Amino acid sequence: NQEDSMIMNQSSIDRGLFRSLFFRSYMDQEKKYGMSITETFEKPQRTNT
Amino acid sequence: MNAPDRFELFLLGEGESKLKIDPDTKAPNAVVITFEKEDHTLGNLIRAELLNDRKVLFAAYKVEHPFFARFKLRIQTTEGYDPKDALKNACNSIINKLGALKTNFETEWNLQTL
Amino acid sequence: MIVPVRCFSCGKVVGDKWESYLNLLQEDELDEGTALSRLGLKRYCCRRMILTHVDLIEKFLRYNP
Amino acid sequence: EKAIPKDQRATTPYMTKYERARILGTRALQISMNAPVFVDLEGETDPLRIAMKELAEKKIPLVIRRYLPDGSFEDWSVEELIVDL
Amino acid sequence: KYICAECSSKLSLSRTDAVRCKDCGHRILLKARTKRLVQFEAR
Amino acid sequence: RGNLMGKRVDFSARTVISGDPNLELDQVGVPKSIAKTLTYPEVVTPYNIDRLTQLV
Amino acid sequence: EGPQVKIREASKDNVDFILSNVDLAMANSLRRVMIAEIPTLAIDSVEVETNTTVLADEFIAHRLGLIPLQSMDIEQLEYSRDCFCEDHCDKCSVVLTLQAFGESESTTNVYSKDLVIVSNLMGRNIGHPIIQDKEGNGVLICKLRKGQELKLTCVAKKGIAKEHAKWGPAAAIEFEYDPWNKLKHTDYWYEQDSAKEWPQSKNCEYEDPPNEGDPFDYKAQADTFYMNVESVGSIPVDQVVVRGIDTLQKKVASILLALTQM
Ligand SMILES: [Zn+2]
Ligand SMILES: [Zn+2]
Ligand SMILES: [Zn+2]
């Protein structure tokens, strides 16, 4: 714990001490580049890709 | 992301011996016993039992790093006394004391109604 | 959200008495310390674990989902 | 004409730490590239240790060109250099 | 395959179909959890 | 001053530092993941041919 | 004769006793094995089939793991890593099912008693959730609103607290010795008077107060250790100490066996 460091109890850590949930959100759009042409949300099948 | 295997602390790894005994050249009749996957619990007790024996001269336990569940016990006895025999005697005495304590605790618990 | 299952410091189970703690605070109108002592919390670790907890689970359940 | 004869050299005969490091690195690189080894190896495989042993035994055939600011250079064999370290 | 944020009713819509809830005008159209087996550990 | 005096490096890692009384003065602890990602191009030699084969 | 135990008091999940004619190292090792080396049964794996509560699957799984489970017959149970089984066979694991859902306007509280044992215990009183509250509900797990369905399976394996604190059979293990400063092990921090600043310990009444007339006893050693063991509920304190002693003896015997083999 030198240099202001700290020692944390492993038992407490695994027992519910300072556990956190991190949520990250990704956004996607089908923005149209040219009329009549738009992106599609489909699983690629390796054909023509 | 690379935390140590928690179960590995008390479980022997593949191709790993529980005890590794090697000679020590620092002093005559000195040996080093590396205990794997063990903590202060057994090392301190074994060393304390060893120090209680008159024949045993030096008995010191060292933990290299908290990350690794392993320690080293340096044992030096008098001439003509094999350190392994001293360790075996200390372990037998520890077992006898533990059995006596268990029997006493059981008797006391049985005697008490609660 | 919910009261911790076990005390962080020692590991004593404290989740059983949270409802009893609330009942003692409300039904019997007892003070925090007296209620905690009655519940059987001697070490201050469990005392602060129970006292400092906040019931955010009810607030989350206030929403329709 | 710039080259100075073997004698009448004003540079320090004692080996320099930079020179020692450079010689060790060059010898280790050569050994790693399957270069001949002039010292018998007693169960040693690390190139740096082999280079250190060769320097201790003065078996390194390298040279040092002490370059003066003007441009003149003085040649020094590893064997004659004195390693204070 | 999909649920409504408010109605919370299954839709099971397909491709080239409106993404608006049939019961209400809301069109959040959340999706239900995967049917694949999921396992977690207390560690 | 952006690409000649100071330029980005391939073989290098960066991360937090923690104290360790049980380490030698010249010895520095390294994460296993960083060690795996970072590599050294050791040339094959008869001295360590077996060791390199085992590593491969 | 050896070391003897003087149980000052006993309870359902709390026993205070005194150990005499025992070394400090032995007492410390006993405490360590009792807090860490005692096998216990706790939920290890959580499989979610239909969860829609406000909480998270990992969160609820962690909460379930800490739930105490009966482990009186833990010795009969075998570690999963030891027995040759495909996955969580009845011989090495206990299987429970948690099912719940809300209704019109009454929140559904999930407790330990809601867990239902599904595996065959073969007449073994192991894996039953521990209930100690007066109401008997148990440990609160979560709360479900209308339309929130909770449906999961829990597999509990034999393990020790060293791998995870959830297996800890004892919450707090108080260990004290030398109430009066006879061995000079501790130098009390004082500003006006050491005795006044530091209140006398409860165990002080069980030892003769020191007399200033006599000199310091340099031959004295730690003895008469006052130990209070409290059990979470999985194992009674008496069985907790018995199992700790058994585990320490087994470890010493394993060391001896390794020495003999090598
Ligand atoms: Zn506590
Ligand atoms: Zn809708
Ligand atoms: Zn099995």
UniProtKB/Swiss-Prot annotation, chain A:
Mg(2+) binds at D4. It is found in: Nucleus. The binding of ribonucleoside triphosphate to the RNA polymerase II transcribing complex probably involves a two-step mechanism. The initial binding seems to occur at the entry (E) site and involves a magnesium ion coordinated by three conserved aspartate residues of the two largest RNA Pol II subunits. Present with 18700 molecules/cell in log phase SD medium. DNA-dependent RNA polymerase catalyzes the transcription of DNA into RNA using the four ribonucleoside triphosphates as substrates. Second largest component of RNA polymerases II which synthesizes mRNA precursors and many functional non-coding RNAs. Proposed to contribute to the polymerase catalytic activity and forms the polymerase active center together with the largest subunit. Pol II is the central component of the basal RNA polymerase II transcription machinery. Belongs to the RNA polymerase beta chain family. Component of the RNA polymerase II (Pol II) complex consisting of 12 subunits. This is DNA-directed RNA polymerase II subunit RPB2. The gene is RPB2.
UniProtKB/Swiss-Prot annotation, chain C:
GO terms for molecular function: DNA binding; DNA-directed RNA polymerase activity; zinc ion binding. Its main location: nucleus. Pfam families: RNA_pol_N. It is found in: Nucleus, Nucleolus. The keyword Magnesium does not apply. Keywords: DNA-directed RNA polymerase, Isopeptide bond, Metal-binding, Nucleus, Ribosome biogenesis, Transcription, Ubl conjugation, Zinc. There is a cross-link at K59 (Glycyl lysine isopeptide (Lys-Gly) (interchain with G-Cter in ubiquitin)). PROSITE patterns: RNA_POL_N_8KD. Transmembrane segments: none annotated. Gene3D superfamilies: Homeodomain-like. It comes from the Eukaryota. Zn(2+) binds at C7, C10, C45, C46. GO terms for biological process: nucleolar large rRNA transcription by RNA polymerase I; ribosome biogenesis; RNA-templated transcription; termination of RNA polymerase I transcription; termination of RNA polymerase III transcription; transcription by RNA polymerase I; transcription by RNA polymerase II; transcription by RNA polymerase III. DNA-dependent RNA polymerases catalyze the transcription of DNA into RNA using the four ribonucleoside triphosphates as substrates. Common component of RNA polymerases I, II and III which synthesize ribosomal RNA precursors, mRNA precursors and many functional non-coding RNAs, and a small RNAs, such as 5S rRNA and tRNAs, respectively. Pol II is the central component of the basal RNA polymerase II transcription machinery. Pols are composed of mobile elements that move relative to each other. In Pol II, RBP10 is part of the core element with the central large cleft. Present with 5300 molecules/cell in log phase SD medium. NCBIfam families: PRK04016.1.
From Swiss-Prot, chain F:
The tandem 7 residues repeats in the C-terminal domain (CTD) can be highly phosphorylated. The phosphorylation activates Pol II. Phosphorylation occurs mainly at residues 'Ser-2' and 'Ser-5' of the heptapeptide repeat. The phosphorylated form of Pol II appears to carry, on average, one phosphate per repeat. The phosphorylation state is believed to result from the balanced action of site-specific CTD kinases and phosphatases, and a 'CTD code' that specifies the position of Pol II within the transcription cycle has been proposed. It is found in: Nucleus. DNA-dependent RNA polymerase catalyzes the transcription of DNA into RNA using the four ribonucleoside triphosphates as substrates. Largest and catalytic component of RNA polymerase II which synthesizes mRNA precursors and many functional non-coding RNAs. Forms the polymerase active center together with the second largest subunit. Pol II is the central component of the basal RNA polymerase II transcription machinery. During a transcription cycle, Pol II, general transcription factors and the Mediator complex assemble as the preinitiation complex (PIC) at the promoter. Belongs to the RNA polymerase beta' chain family. This is DNA-directed RNA polymerase II subunit RPB1.
UniProtKB/Swiss-Prot annotation, chain G:
GO terms for molecular function: DNA binding; DNA-directed RNA polymerase activity; metal ion binding; protein dimerization activity. Coiled coil: none annotated. GO terms for cellular component: nucleoplasm; nucleus; RNA polymerase II, core complex. One of its GO terms (biological process) is termination of RNA polymerase II transcription. Its main location: nucleus. It is found in: Nucleus. Component of the RNA polymerase II (Pol II) complex consisting of 12 subunits. Belongs to the archaeal Rpo3/eukaryotic RPB3 RNA polymerase subunit family. DNA-dependent RNA polymerase catalyzes the transcription of DNA into RNA using the four ribonucleoside triphosphates as substrates. Component of RNA polymerase II which synthesizes mRNA precursors and many functional non-coding RNAs. Pol II is the central component of the basal RNA polymerase II transcription machinery. It is composed of mobile elements that move relative to each other. RPB3 is part of the core element with the central large cleft and the clamp element that moves to open and close the cleft. Seems to be involved in transcription termination. This is DNA-directed RNA polymerase II subunit RPB3. The chain holds residues 4 to 265 of 318 of the full protein.
